[PDB]
Amino acid sequence: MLPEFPKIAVVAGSEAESVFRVVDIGTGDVVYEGRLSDSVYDDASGDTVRHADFGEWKRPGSYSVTVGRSSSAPFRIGNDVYRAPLIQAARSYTLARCGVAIDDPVTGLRHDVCHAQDKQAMLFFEDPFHRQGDPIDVSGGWHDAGDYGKYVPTGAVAAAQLMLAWEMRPELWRSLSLSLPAGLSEPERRAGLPDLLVEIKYELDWLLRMQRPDGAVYLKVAGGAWPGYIRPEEDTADRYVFGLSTYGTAQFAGAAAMGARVYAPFLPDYARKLLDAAIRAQRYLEQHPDPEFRYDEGQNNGSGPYEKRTDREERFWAAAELLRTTDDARYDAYIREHFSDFLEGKTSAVFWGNTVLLGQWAYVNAERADADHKASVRASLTAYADELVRWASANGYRSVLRPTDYFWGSAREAMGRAQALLLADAVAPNRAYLETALDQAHWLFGRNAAGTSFMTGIGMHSPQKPHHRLVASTQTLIPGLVVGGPNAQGGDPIMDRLLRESDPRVFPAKAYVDDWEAYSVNEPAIDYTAPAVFVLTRFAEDR
Ligand SMILES: [Zn+2]
């Protein structure tokens, strides 16, 4: 943890104790003694929780908290503590690349070129531009999660979140090396593009390939069956382009419009290419105002559904990001005509099924947005942030999750909520927003009822058997990956059995197991890691 921020140790049990000691491990000296807070029952975990507050101790070092007979694992106080996990999480995207060979000396991850057949992936249906079965080059991009499919909604939202991390602290990222393996992104590296932007461009390049001539965007690339726990270069079965959706077309437009702004200082032609693509997508959407989600039978036989049959929050993001990037006030008129509700409220954490906050963030940073409506959107952000602070401040684990929030992707949700707190802090600075955001990083790294980090490679306990075909087939730790997190609703055979057989029933915050097949809680995905990168950006030391 950081010298200038709050410092609590959360203790489950230990009801009979009254005091704690913070001990410097190098000297054995007690640097701080205090009284424990009162024990309070935590609904989501079933734990009775108290905490040791030593925030006023600011000296860097390695320490342990003693309570009664027990002493915590060593932990650090230091300004530099979040730089390493930020770097690991960001470079994990490089290690997820598809269509290239990877030989990474940092982790030892090695694989041959994978999914070369994506250069001729077959369209699963007939459309005005391709006969069914016709090949399209949709190579490149990132493998989505523990599988090797590539999906526009999560690709666009993850890329956007990473670009917002760039925009939060460009000077941090200009001097941050991701130790890109040999052979990767050679033209971009020769041009001196910052490593984070090199990596994001690999995904944007792929997203561009998913757009068809009329501006609409296909849904995903995958096979007709799920591969086993095999290296990606062994997944030789035919690959297809599946689906067509307006919500994904709009997310593509948002990501491309954001990329146009982000890349313009570096690559004027590429930035223009992104902006023109974003506008073709927006024009498709304006001419096709009703939502579409195409479903052909079999398209989910080897890949996830990522189904949304409405699209308002994503159309709003597309228009608002275009407003921000282009300064064309016609987008403000369009937004005020169709999306006035999102200018007055409805803030919610970013995820692939709801990008309202990406749109609100774009709007409040748009020079040509109406000033009174920008004020309204700032108030929507602060109302949501204030709610998160209220929840976390009264929660024994300082968590922004409620008992009913332990659904698939809860760890993403915790970090998406932290992201929202940081965006609120940007428009209306408030130390409570910063501190509560940082509390979700403490939670993510293991200060939680499950007793484990949900980011690989970090924490006394962390996921060692993530549902991840590359990790499993190569037996190589890839640090920095965020797994779904505790999920009391089930969805895989391991969790389904645990939840149905347990008596007493499992408490939602503990509905997690570290097993290869527990994909409803233990699978990492690009859109889980992305908000973690964003949040850690704020707290990482520059140099
Ligand atoms: Zn691949």
Numbering used by the authors: 1 to 543
Paper text:
J30, an endoglucanase with activity against p-nitrophenyl cellobiose (pNPC), which produces cellobiose as its primary product, was identified and analyzed from metagenomic data originating from a switchgrass-adapted microbial community. Its likely source is the moderately thermophilic bacterium Thermobacillus composti KWC4, and its catalytic optimum is 50°C. It is annotated as a GH family 9 member consisting of an N-terminal Ig-like domain and a C-terminal catalytic domain. The predominant architectural element of the catalytic domain is an (α/α)6-barrel structure composed of 12 α-helices arranged in an alternating pattern as is typical within GH family 9 as well as other families.
Using the CtCel9A crystal structure as a reference model and comparing the geometry of its Zn2+-binding site with the corresponding segments within J30, we created a mutant called J30 CCH (denoting the residue identities of the mutations: A98C, G114C and Y143H). The crystal structure of J30 CCH was solved to a resolution of 1.46 Å. The root-mean-square deviation between the backbone C, N and Cα atoms of the crystal structures of the wild-type and triple-mutant enzymes is 0.094 Å, i.e. they are virtually identical. The local atomic displacement parameters of the residues neighboring residues 98, 114 and 143 show a similar trend, suggesting stabilization of the mutated site through the introduction of the Zn2+ ion. Our design of a mutant version of J30 based on structural data further underlines this relationship. Here, the majority of the increase in stability is likely to be a result of the net exchange of a hydrogen bond between the side chains of His115 and Tyr143 (J30 wt) for four coordinating bonds between the Zn2+ ion and the side chains of Cys98, Cys114, His115 and His143 (J30 CCH).
